[PDB]
Amino acid sequence: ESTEAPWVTIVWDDPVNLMSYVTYVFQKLFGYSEPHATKLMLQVHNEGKAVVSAGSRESMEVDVSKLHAAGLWATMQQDR
């Protein structure tokens, strides 16, 4: 198949960061509203991970880097 396909950024639950911090980071880095950021934070915390953004591989690479700088456990993968 082709490599021009969409990717996602995933945040993984970590035992150190405050829930309030994670909500704030999603608002700050992605411009998300409070209800949206809180829902994603709670999904990370209750499911162990959440897709937080989606787009091209190169765009997701930026989101991962931004999240790492904020101290969050982020990875990216191709979306199937």
**What residue ranges bind Mg ion (CB under 5 A)?**
14, 72-73
Residue 34 interacts with, from Ni ion, Mg ion, none (CB under 5-8 Å by kind) = none
Residue 79 interacts with, from Ni ion, Mg ion, none (CB under 5-8 Å by kind) = Ni ion
Residue sitting closest to Ni ion (CB): 79
Count, residues near Ni ion per rule CB under 5 A = 1
Between 15 and 48, CB nearer to Ni ion: 48
User: Distance between CA 20 and CA 68 in Å, rounded?
Assistant: 17
Residue 74 and residue 20 in contact, taking contact as beta carbons nearer than 8 Å: no
User: Distance between CA 24 and CA 5 in Å, rounded?
Assistant: 30
Residue 67 and residue 9 in contact, taking contact as beta carbons nearer than 8 Å: yes
